Structures are given as C-alpha cells and as structure tokens.
C-alpha cells in the first residue's frame, strides 16, 4: 500500500537553454513533477514523496566526504505530499550553473532512502531520475550500486527529453540502457520514458478507487447440498468519498453552526410539541391510521439473514436485460483456499453454460436487508470463471404501458430514400473497426476506459481555489472534452450523410 | 386516458336476495357486500384518488336529492376510506342482515328508471374530471318488471340515455333457484351483450371471482419522466420521451402524528449560529473541504456550477455493434425512449427509420445523456426494441429504444486473484442432471415483494380492526421438500464425487 518515492532532478545550465520552437526541458520536468504531486495529493494513498536536486551551487547531504557527493542538496525530506510542496516547486526550485554527475545523485538518493525507510513499512521504493545526460559520467562504482539496488529492492525509472542528439547524449543513453539491463534486463528498456509521454499519461487525476468487502455465504440447492462462496461487488455507481462541510462565512469554522428541528401543530396558536410525543403513522385512503415504530418492528416481516438459495433454473432466453433491477452487480467465486468448493462451483458453472441456463436465486445481505430475487449466470474466461448475479424485478415493480405501433403506421411510414439515407448515416458513423486478418472487432471509442469527468472537474476546481484563493473558477479543460467526444474521423465521415438526412427529413419546431 | 374512475354499486334489496338455497352457502346480499368490501380494499391499496359509491334499490326508506321512493343512497361518490368499509361491515352476517332490514327495510316495489336517474344525478354531482363512469347491478331477478310493460319501456329508454351520456353498465347476476337468463329483459340495458352471455346461468357470474381477487399492488398511470431532445447534429434535432418501465416499489412515507389528539404535525428545520443564537440565512454560509492539510472554501453557487457540463438532452455519438455490449456491465435500471410529435413535427418518421435500420444492422446508438440541468453527463446505449405481441394480440413488448447506462472506469472494481480448477466431465454431467431435475419456467411477474405485502396486510388489519393480520405466503422461499424429493440420490452421488469423505462444508 505505502510507497516512498524520491524524485531526483537537476538544475544545471544545460537545460536553461533549448530550441525556441519547443519548451525547455526544465519546464517539462517541472510540469511532470507538478502533475505527479497533484495526483498524489488528490489521491489519499498515504504515499511519501522526497525531493532531491543535483547540480546546484549549495551543498547539503547526509554524506559529504571530500569533493565527492558535492553540489547536491536534499531539498525536501521524505514525508506526505502537501500544497506546501506545490508552492516549493513553484518558486523554490530555481535553475543553476554548476554541473553534477547523476551517479552521485543516485547514491545520495539511495542513502536517503536507506536512512529514512527505517521505522515505516514502505513495501515499495522508487527512484525517478530526470536528467539530460549532458554532464560527463564518473562510472567507477557501478558494481556496488547495482549490488545495493538489488539488495534493497529499489526500482529505478529515468526520464529524458527525447524518445539528432549529441554523442555525449548517446553515450549517456547507452550507459542508462546498460544500467537498466543489469537491474532487470530486456523489460528495463520499457522503463525509459520521455517527457512528452509522461505528460500524456499524467494529464488526468487518479480515478476514485475503493476496495470491495469479501462477502462469504453458502450457495444451497435444496437442503443437503451447499457450496461455500465469496461475493464481491463489481459494478456500482461510484461517488465522492468526501462531502462538502457547512462552515460559517465569517469565522470559517464548522463549530459555530448547528441544525435544529422544531415540531408544531396545525393551529393558529402554533403550539410546540416535543419529540417524545410524536408518533409514526400512515395514510390508508382518506384517513390516517396510527402505526407506532415498536408495533411495526413487532409485526415486521422477519427473515433469516445471509441467504443465497437457488429457487430454480430457467433458460437464458426467459431472462431479459431490460428487466434487470438494483444498483449493483455481484461476482461470486469459490471460497478462498478451498479446492472442493472451487470444483463444485466450476461444475455448476460449466453445466449452466453447456445447458444455456441461469439460476433464479434468493439473495439477502443480512438480517436487516430486505430479501431479493435475482439471476445468477455463468461467466467463463480463459483464466477465471465465476458467477455473475444481478437483481430481478418484482410484480409490483413492473409497469404496463401501451405504445402505438410504428411499423404499421401510415402517417409515419418512412420512404425508401429515407431508409437509404439512414443506412448511409449508420454506416458512416461506425464506432467499431472489423480487422479482416484476425476477423476481429476493435473498439474506436471505448467508454468503459474513460474516467468520470465529474471528479476531474471537482479536483481541478479545488486545486485552482487552493492555489488561487481569490480568483474565479476556470472553464472545463480541453482534454476532458476531447476524451468525451469521438475521434475526428467519425465526425468528418458523417457530415455528408447528416446533410442528406437533414435534406430528406422535414423537421419543424412547434 | 385522463381523469378518475367513478363507480356505483347498485345492490338489490328484494326478498329473494335474502334466501339461501343451501344451509352451508352465502346469501346473495352477503356475496354482494363481500365483493363491495374487496373492491373497496383493492381501490384503497391501488388507486386511492378514485371515486366510489354505494346505493340500494328496493328498500323501504329513501335518501336522495330527487326524493324518489324506495331508493336509499347509502354512500355518495367519494374517495374510499376505512370508515366506509367499517360501515358496510355491519351487514356482513345474518345479524348484519337483520340490522340492514331494521335500518332500511326490504321487500318493497321499485322502478329501474328512477334508480338509473338517481345514479345519473350522483354522477353529475361530481365536480372532478371522470375518465370512466361505470355501474354494476347486483341482482338475482331476471324479470324485475313482467307485470308492467310501461315500466320496462321506461327502463330501456333510461338505459339508452345513460349509454348515450357515456355510462357503462354491468350485470353481476347472482344465483337464482330457477336460473338467471339474460335474454328476457337485460339484453337492452346491458351495455355489451357477449355472444356466449346468452344461455341460462345456474350459478353466480364469473366476474365475482375477479372482484374478490384482492389486488395489493399500486397502479400508476402512464407518465413521461422527461421530454428530451435527441441531437444527431447541431442542426438535426428530434423530440423524444423517456419512460421507466421498471421502477422499484417503496412503502408510503411515514407521517408524524400527535400522540394526544392524533392529528398531523408539521416540521421545520432552521440553522442558527451558536454565539448570537439568531437565524442564519443560506446566503451567510459557505462550503469547505480539507485536502492536503488545507481548507478550500467555495460558495454554494460555485458548488452547483461544478456539475454543469452540457444542456439537458441526448447527444448522438455513433453506432456500436451489439456484440460489444456486456450483460455483466449493468449499472442502473434501463429506460424506454419513444417518439414525441408534440414538440417537434417529423420526429416519428426519423425515429422509425432509425429503429428499423438498427434492427436490420444489429447496432445500438451510443449517446451522451444529461437528464436535468447541473447534472454530469453519462454514457448511454439505445438498443432497438421491436414490437412483440402474445397470442391474444395484447402487446407485451412495445416498440422503441432501450436506454442502458454504460459504466465509467471508476464504476468498476478489482477482484482478488484466484486460481482456476476445472471439473472433470463426470461431475459436470452429474450437475447437469441436477440442474435438469429442477427446471422451471420463469417470468417477470412470478414473484411478489413479501415486505410490501406484509406491510399492506398489517395496515389493513390496523385500519379495519381485524382480529389478526393475514399472513402472506412468501413465494421466494425455496421449496426444500420438493427439491429433495425430486433430486433423490443425485445429491449424494455428487457429494461423493466432488467432496472428500471428511470435508464438513458447514464448518
């Protein structure tokens, strides 16, 4: 869960100048660091971030010795991210003229990690190096650095402004590649990112993540067969964990504001009645019949909680998606560390899949939870198989509405040209591509992979208010709109069909 | 269909209505009263805004606006209530029959034209808008007027006038010693004379079985949740209506009453500052949120502005193959999208063409959905829905679009990694046999909500002061005995073949 990340940067003059047609590497590194710290701040994962810079005039390190380990400062110790860190990177981080070798930076970073790791359970450690490799390399301690990195299990990631470079940059890249091969090997080559690539990925706030609670129960078929099962919530409408707090406008404190409830009677005198004299009731037609809470509990419908029983089995065709109810989907696997239960569940899943059947079941979360009738159907994949449970409607929840037929409507009968135009529009606006080589469908616009814009907007506005206490909120970010819209190709291809449809179909507002 | 249903229960008060053919049987009056009470309870549970009335013809006393003779209007057209049911309850038994005889009287002459006139006057008294007007005649005398021909002609003329006015007439004939034959007189009065409803009936009408079947589920008239605009482009726009074919049923909200006198009490919540103690208007308050050991303050207006993305409606995005939709991605109950020509003319043709072509090409329309203002947009798929009718041509699946919400990346969760173990063919076959043994046909209306039914039963018992509430049978409980009997020895074989000798699933 926890993670200690030491971000190592440089302020050498070699980044202070660059081609005017592109942003300076120093600016790119600053933006990457800012985005990372913003994501960490707005994602409460209890990770720790330290900041070290090599290539500065000053010298402040735990280890000094002689000329070695010089011109490096531990700007920010290892602690939780905060807006103070954002202010520090905004202003405190300044360019410089002195150069420095990144090997000394790496050794000091590992020294800081080793010194500050003790006392906390940081199961992961990462070192990110943002350098241009313009300075010369003092390759004299590679064996020991590799040995220490392997012993301490500390990961390494590098960022460069290129994915037309000087020979010094080529030599630096080669040494970087060798270090990565020694650390991991082939896969290390995928850990060398560019500033543009990092900017592309880190342009969105971390999505809200919650851990589902394992729900143990027993799947019963009759009264003699029971299979231990564990259920987890898979799909649900995620909300914001935090909620707005009502505070006074002047003192900016929530301790001076409180809520009160007042009960009175329907009379001119406006008599006041205490809470103890208030009873519960219901309306039965044109009258009101008292129904006290104690009597309601006494006469309430009592059922045994935590029940997962198989009412029966029915053909999949009889269960339609439009009837699905509830606000959640459950994934049911076998009990953890239980081979017999796994075998039984696999047998049931395979039987249902082969016979094209689903199980109508009764589900109750606990004693206080109302009973539900739902459908469980198999879900078999190349690697995992389980059951998927979704609630089903009751008799009272069905609505019988009658709608006029459109197929046999003389007034609204489309013509052949209109149908051809609609067909052209549908073909032009296709959101799936059929690759013939593999004969497979590829999704051009995967909606499931789009983060919720609501949380992005909320976090952006909160950040803007925090960093700018007195300023109007900004507009919606362009990238949010881009990700909420289809690729430009679909829009371009659909213009002519849309114009033809507009020409063919007369639409008049009333 | 707009308005309210008005219903009048005409009950005969002749001598023949108070005689029982057999010792262990219900008299016609008792059956009529039971049916009236059942209908009252069903109306209270389902539609409490409807109008019902109870009238008697053939009694000695009279009570009506016109002051006709031998017609007693016990209850005028008004919303149903427990008081009326309790009042009717005093005629249920034989003691109730004697009480009815003493209070009103019976065995007197009557004229049907005057009864129909009184019913029409009662209908006219109502001031609301009535979608339906119906009268039911509970009688066991197929020839009320055989001696006087003029009275029969007057009754026929009055029935014709009522039919012209738009009043429906039903005859709920009751058992007669010699049989009830509709052909003598009631062919003309009855609004509809079915081809099969011409022979002599030796038993009560079958409609009484329907009446006695209590309905304990709320019925909601058709209503449009919203009327939105579907925008295929910035220039092409059509008007659509969104409906909810499936909606969860909730218990009626509790009300707060005063203990001493039993009358409603109204509540009010007010915010006040601690030091001064005076009231605090909403304009003198803000919102706060703690992030990064800092306090961020935003006004209420900005907080609501944070949710504004686009104007309400549906915005087209493209078309997707139906194979890419996943059943296990359910997030919210689906809705129904139908054309609406009231706002935009020509929407029906385009909608029909889109539906037809989507059905032909097996595609679903992806769209961005914004129901109301200041609501973050969601992603929806409109799946074509064809019109499916049953054997009796009664529509079961309407034509239109099915709106299904699609999940975002945040709405999904990560499951723990678990190793997969595959069962051998023998176990799969045994479980296949077990599954086949418990095969049954499922439908959307084969189950009832036990909690709501029990709540309604308890409320009815409390209102009408029944000795004990009626206990509802729960159809959701598995029939363990039946499954055990059907499966037989299959369970033992499966347990032997799948479980070790010492497994103890329970512990």
């Amino acid at each position: 869960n926890k993670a200690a990340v030491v971000l190592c940067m440089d302020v050498g003059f070699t980044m202070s100048n660059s081609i005017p047609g592109i942003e300076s590497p120093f600016e790119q590194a600053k933006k990457v660091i800012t985005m990372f710290v913003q994501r960490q701040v707005f994602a409460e994962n209890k990770d720790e971030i330290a900041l070290v810079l090599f290539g500065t005039d000053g010298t402040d390190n735990p280890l000094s010795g002689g000329d070695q380990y010089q011109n490096i400062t531990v700007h920010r110790h290892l602690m939780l991210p905060d807006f103070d860190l954002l202010e520090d990177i905004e202003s405190k981080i300044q360019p410089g003229s002195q150069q420095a070798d990144f090997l000394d930076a790496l050794i000091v970073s590992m020294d800081v990690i080793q010194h500050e790791t003790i006392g906390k359970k940081f199961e992961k450690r990462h070192i990110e190096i943002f350098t241009d490799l313009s300075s010369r390399f003092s390759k004299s301690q590679l064996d020991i650095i590799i040995h220490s990195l392997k012993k301490c299990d500390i990961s390494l990631q590098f960022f460069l402004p290129f994915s037309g470079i000087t020979e010094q940059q080529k030599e630096g890249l080669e040494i970087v590649k060798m270090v990565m091969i020694s650390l991991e090997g082939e896969d290390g080559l995928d850990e060398i990112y560019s500033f543009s690539e990092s900017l592309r990925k880190l342009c969105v706030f971390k999505k809200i993540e919650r851990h589902s609670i394992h729900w143990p129960c027993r799947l019963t078929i009759g009264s003699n067969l029971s299979i231990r099962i564990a259920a987890y919530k898979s799909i649900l409408q995620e909300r914001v964990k935090k909620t707005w707090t009502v505070v006074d406008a002047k003192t900016l404190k929530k301790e001076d504001i409180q809520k009160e409830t007042v009960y009175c009677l329907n009379d001119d005198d406006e008599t006041e009645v205490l809470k103890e004299d208030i009873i519960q009731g219901f309306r039965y037609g044109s009258d009101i019949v008292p129904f006290s809470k104690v009597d309601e509990e006494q006469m309430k419908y009592k059922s045994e909680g935590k029940c997962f029983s198989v009412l029966g089995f029915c053909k999949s065709s009889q269960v339609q998606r439009r009837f699905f109810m509830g606000n959640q989907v459950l994934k049911v696997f076998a009990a953890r560390d239980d081979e017999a239960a796994a075998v039984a569940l696999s047998s049931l899943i395979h039987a249902l899949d082969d016979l094209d059947m689903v199980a109508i079941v009764r589900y109750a979360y606990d004693k206080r939870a109302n009973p539900q009738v739902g459908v469980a159907f198999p879900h078999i994949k190349h690697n995992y198989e389980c059951l998927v449970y979704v609630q089903l409607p009751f008799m009272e929840d069905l609505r019988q509405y009658m709608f006029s037929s459109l197929k046999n409507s003389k007034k609204y009968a489309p013509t052949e040209a209109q149908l051809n135009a609609v067909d052209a529009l549908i073909d032009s606006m296709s959101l799936a591509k059929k690759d013939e080589k593999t004969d497979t469908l590829e999704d051009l616009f995967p909606t499931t992979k789009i983060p919720n814009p609501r949380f992005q907007r909320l976090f952006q506005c909160l950040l803007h208010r925090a960093l700018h206490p007195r300023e109007p909120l900004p507009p919606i970010q362009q990238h949010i709109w881009n990700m909420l819209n289809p690729p430009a190709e679909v829009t371009t291809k659909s213009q002519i069909p849309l114009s033809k449809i507009k020409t063919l179909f007369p639409l008049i507002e009333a | 269909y707009s308005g309210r249903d008005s219903l009048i229960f005409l009950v005969d008060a002749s001598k023949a209505m108070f005689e029982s053919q057999s010792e262990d049987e219900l008299t016609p009056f008792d059956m009529s009263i039971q049916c009236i009470q059942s209908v009252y309870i069903s109306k209270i549970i389902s539609s409490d805004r409807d109008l019902l009335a109870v009238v008697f013809y053939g009694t000695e006393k009279d009570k009506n606006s016109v002051n006709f003779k031998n017609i007693y209007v016990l209850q005028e057209l008004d919303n149903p209530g427990a008081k009326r049911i309790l009042e009717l309850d005093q005629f249920k038994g034989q003691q109730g029959q004697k009480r009815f005889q003493d209070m009103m009287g019976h065995g007197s002459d009557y004229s049907l034209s005057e009864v129909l006139w009184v019913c029409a006057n009662l209908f006219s008294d109502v001031q609301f808008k009535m979608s339906h007007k119906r009268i039911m005649l509970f009688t066991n005398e197929d020839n009320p007027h055989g001696n006087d021909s003029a009275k029969a002609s007057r009754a026929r003329t009055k029935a014709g006038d009522l039919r012209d006015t738009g009043i429906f007439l039903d005859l709920m004939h009751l058992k007669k010693p010699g049989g009830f034959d509709i052909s003598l007189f009631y062919r003309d009065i009855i609004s509809i004379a079915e081809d099969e409803d011409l022979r002599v009936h030796f038993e009560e009408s079958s409609k009484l079985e329907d009446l006695l079947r209590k309905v304990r589920a709320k019925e909601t008239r058709k209503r449009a949740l919203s009327r939105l605009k579907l925008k295929l482009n910035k220039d092409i726009v059509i008007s659509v209506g969104i409906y909810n074919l499936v909606q969860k049923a909730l218990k009626p909200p509790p009300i707060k009453l005063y203990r001493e006198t039993n009358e409603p009490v109204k509540t009010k919540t007010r915010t006040f500052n601690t030091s001064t103690g005076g009231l605090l208007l909403p304009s003198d308050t803000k919102r706060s949120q703690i992030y990064g050991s800092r306090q961020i303050i935003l006004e209420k207006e900005e907080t609501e502005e944070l949710k504004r993305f686009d104007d309400p409606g549906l915005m087209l995005m493209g078309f997707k193959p139906l194979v890419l939709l996943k059943k296990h991605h359910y997030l919210r109950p689906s809705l129904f999208v139908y054309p609406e020509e009231s706002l935009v003319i020509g929407s029906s043709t385009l909608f029909s063409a889109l539906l037809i072509k989507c059905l032909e090409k097996e595609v679903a329309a992806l769209c961005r959905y914004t129901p109301r203002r200041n609501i973050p947009p969601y992603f929806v798929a409109l799946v074509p829905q064809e019109e499916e009718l049953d054997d009796q041509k009664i529509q079961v699946t309407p034509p239109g679009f099915q709106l299904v919400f699609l999940p975002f990346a945040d709405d999904k969760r990560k499951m723990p990694f678990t190793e997969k173990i595959m069962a051998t063919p023998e176990q799969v076959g045994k479980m296949k046999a077990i599954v086949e043994k418990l095969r049954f046909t499922y439908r959307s209306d084969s189950f009832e909500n036990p909690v709501l039914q029990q709540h309604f039963r308890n409320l009815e018992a409390l209102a009408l002061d029944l000795m004990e509430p009626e206990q509802a049978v729960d159809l959701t409980l598995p029939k363990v005995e039946a499954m055990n009997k059907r499966l037989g020895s299959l369970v033992d074989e499966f347990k032997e073949l799948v479980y070790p000798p010492d497994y103890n699933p329970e512990g």
């Binding site: - | 979608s131 409609k207 329907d210 009446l211 008239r221 049954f440 084969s446």
Partner: peptide, 23 residues
C-alpha cells in the same frame, strides 16, 4: 379490451403470482 381488469380500467388484469412450478 379482452382480459381487462374490472377494478382499474385501462390496466390489464394481472394474474396471480404462482412462484416456482417444476415441470
């Protein structure tokens, strides 16, 4: 029109719930 509820006009007479009925 056919199979119409005698209590609530405009709505079809909902059949009684039958639960599970094995074949």
């Amino acid at each position: 029109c056919p199979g119409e509820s005698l209590i609530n006009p405009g709505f079809k007479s909902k059949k009684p719930a039958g639960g599970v009925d094995f074949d």
